[PDB]
């Protein structure tokens, strides 16, 4: 399932006026604007590969890339991005199907020259996305990566060598991946035939763009190309209340699959569940009555609906009665030593509730164990699952339970007669993490109303201001949300 094949002076073609995208989401009508961004120069020399002899080299990623193709038959499917591309750092895959555009950010181990059979494993998959597919008619794409955000622009124009004329690329995707990218490679589909694609690199430049009456771009001049063009730039020619509005609340976060699980786990082999890319409603599991303990350290109970974190975890146990007091920062007592220990600078919450009606039996559960003998204390958030016999003497055990060779695993005895302090309490611990990456887990955002023909404040999606709102007749482009 891993084939190698390579049986092999690229040409150079002009890019007359190609690769001008929409810098931002603002609707400007009949204006001549000036911009300073990463653009592709005018009359450059783009590289023309026809990798099919067969060879798909790995190319650099200096600041961004402009990629164009003209093959009618669907041969080119997707791209792979990464730093080392060899099973030791995160990598990104955008292979798409006949009706899906699935995107995965995982720890891949790629082949020599992957083709559609590309990778061997996928260890830690930290992202996912599904939507409508991206793909003689020229198709052209622009890829940028800044501040942990991956940005994709694209366009499709029918033609009948790149044409001459002007076409502006509209925004298509913005992802908060967070990985570091410096090399990329394309991948083809083999059941074949010749396939040609064009590659060019972006540079920091300044442009002068022209917005016509309807908000579309129809012309632009590079401000370095000519002594004449430099002159064109200089001449610049060729309270009552407050309403808060916010998008709907859809992507609720899955807290029902942890607090309402059918069967929990032991304490010596506990469970971990990564939670990310969700909207967490922290005030639905506080205003309740089941929980008899909601002890929170590092934050305030009612300030969890205005904060955003990078990551959130969840740990689960079943313990007995008067041991929940040992789950706290700075405790001991044979369950904070050998089973589960909390760091000193904890930032989280601990929630425990009685479950005597589900984990007891007339004879006995005899299913929940705990560690009892160990050589050294546990480091914070460290799990041990082995069952080697604990040697308490000089003579080696040789794996036999005897004189000075204790069995370090004892079972809880549960039955519906013991008093409080011996009945099974289920425990869940929530931990928060924030480091170096864009924050995805966030609380809900409220919305008030819409009053028109009055002098009021407003907070449309974070654009605070004051004035009067009345219906108008202007027509924005679909992706423009600002005005101006």
């Amino acid at each position: 399932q891993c084939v190698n094949l390579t049986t092999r002076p690229p040409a150079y073609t002009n890019s007359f006026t190609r690769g001008v995208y929409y810098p931002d989401k603002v609707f400007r009508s009949s204006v001549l604007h000036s911009t300073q961004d990463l653009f592709l120069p005018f009359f450059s020399n783009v590289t023309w590969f026809h990798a099919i002899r067969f060879d798909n080299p790995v190319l650099p990623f200096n600041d961004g890339v402009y990629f164009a193709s003209t093959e009618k038959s669907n041969i080119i499917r997707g791209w792979i991005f990464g730093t080392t591309l060899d099973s030791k750092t995160q990598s990104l895959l955008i292979v798409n199907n006949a009706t899906n555009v699935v995107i995965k950010v995982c720890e891949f181990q790629f082949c020599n020259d992957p083709f559609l059979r590309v990778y061997s494993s996928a260890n830690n998959c930290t992202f996912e996305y599904v939507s409508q597919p991206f793909l003689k008619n020229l198709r052209e794409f622009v890829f940028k990566n800044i501040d942990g955000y991956f940005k994709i622009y694209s366009k499709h124009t029918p033609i009948n060598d790149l044409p001459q004329g002007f076409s502006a690329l509209e925004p298509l995707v913005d992802l908060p991946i967070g990985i570091n990218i410096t090399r990329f490679q394309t991948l083809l589909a083999l059941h074949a035939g010749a396939a040609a694609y064009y590659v060019g690199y972006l540079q920091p430049r300044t442009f002068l763009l022209k917005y016509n009456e309807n908000g579309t771009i129809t012309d632009a001049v590079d401000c370095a190309l000519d002594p004449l063009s430099e002159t064109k730039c200089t001449l610049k020619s060729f309270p009552t209340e407050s309403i808060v509005r916010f998008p709907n609340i859809t992507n609720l976060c899955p807290f029902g699959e942890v607090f309402n699980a059918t069967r929990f786990a032991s304490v010596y082999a506990w469970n971990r569940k990564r939670i990310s890319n969700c909207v967490a409603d922290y005030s639905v599991l506080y205003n309740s009555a089941s929980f008899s303990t909601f002890k929170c350290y590092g934050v305030s109970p009612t300030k969890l609906n205005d904060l955003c974190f990078t990551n959130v975890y969840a740990d689960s146990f079943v313990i007995r009665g008067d041991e929940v007091r040992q789950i706290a920062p700075g405790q001991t007592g044979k369950i904070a030593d050998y089973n589960y220990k909390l760091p000193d600078d904890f930032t989280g919450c601990v929630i425990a509730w009685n479950s005597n009606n589900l984990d007891s039996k007339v004879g006995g559960n005899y299913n929940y164990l705990y560690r009892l003998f160990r050589k050294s204390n546990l480091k914070p958030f460290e799990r041990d699952i082995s069952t080697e016999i604990y040697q308490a003497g000089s003579t080696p055990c040789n794996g036999v339970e005897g004189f000075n060779c204790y069995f370090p695993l004892q079972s809880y005895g549960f039955q519906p007669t013991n008093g409080v302090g011996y009945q099974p309490y289920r425990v869940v611990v929530l931990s928060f993490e924030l480091l170096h990456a864009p924050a995805t887990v966030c609380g809900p955002k409220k919305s008030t109303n819409l009053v028109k023909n009055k002098c009021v404040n407003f907070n449309f999606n974070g654009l605070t201001g004051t004035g009067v709102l009345t219906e108008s007749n202007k027509k924005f482009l679909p992706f423009q949300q600002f005005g101006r």
Partner: antibody, heavy 120, light 111 residues
């Protein structure tokens, strides 16, 4: 107070077998190793071997190897001993016991059963 | 394994002391403190008297007292009565995850 109760007398022949039970009440069953002792009618006590009611591991005297087997059942908290090579020199009285230290083995046998008389 | 030996018989005067002995006990640093003594009356179950050579359990008067030295353990009784008419059994460790008993001593008092 802790109570141990054994079953009644049995009479067998040198081809038969025997099983002895031992019911424990008044304490926590699975926190004490249980030892087995024998006494011929007019001689000194002889040790047999032990059992761990938590795990189930056992160990015997090399003399008895191949003929004796020990088992437990925790739901009703009982321990069973099986012997299956009865001879003329196996008529005796059989006892239970109980260790003092909870999760450790040591022959400080403090509370005893009542004795089953097997007159083969 | 090993084999512990103790005298078949002993006797004492009412008010005197007796020193029923034991020997052959495992003599090693790791496993030194493992000796016990039991008493049986005819037609009954035995009783615990001394464990962990000198530790004594509740319910038995301080007259009974154990000791050990070198390779031999020993029992010591005082204030003998007519009640101390019983058979005493030594007990020790025997190496390969196995414990062993002793022959037994009949303690006799005359009146």
């Amino acid at each position: 107070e802790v109570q141990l109760v054994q079953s009644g007398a049995e009479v067998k022949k040198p081809g038969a077998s025997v099983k002895v039970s031992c019911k424990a009440s008044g304490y926590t069953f699975t926190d004490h190793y249980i030892h087995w002792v024998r006494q011929a009618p007019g001689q000194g006590l002889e040790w047999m071997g032990w059992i761990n009611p938590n795990s189930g591991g056992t160990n015997y005297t090399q003399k008895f190897k191949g003929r004796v087997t020990l088992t437990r059942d925790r739901s009703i908290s009982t321990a069973y001993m099986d012997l299956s090579r009865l001879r003329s020199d196996d008529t005796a009285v059989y006892y239970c016991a109980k260790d003092v230290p909870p999760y450790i083995v040591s022959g400080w046998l403090d509370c005893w059963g009542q004795g089953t008389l097997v007159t083969v | 394994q090993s084999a512990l030996t103790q005298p078949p018989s002993a006797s004492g005067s009412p008010g005197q002391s007796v020193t029923i002995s034991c020997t052959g006990t495992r003599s090693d640093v790791d496993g030194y403190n493992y000796v016990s003594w039991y008493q049986q009356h005819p037609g009954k179950a035995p009783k615990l008297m001394i464990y962990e050579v000198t530790k004594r359990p509740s319910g038995v008067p301080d007259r009974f007292s154990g000791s050990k030295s070198g390779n031999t353990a020993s029992l010591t009784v005082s204030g003998l009565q007519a009640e101390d008419e019983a058979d005493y059994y030594c007990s020790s460790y025997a190496g390969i995850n196995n414990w062993v008993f002793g022959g037994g001593t009949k303690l006799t008092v005359l009146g």
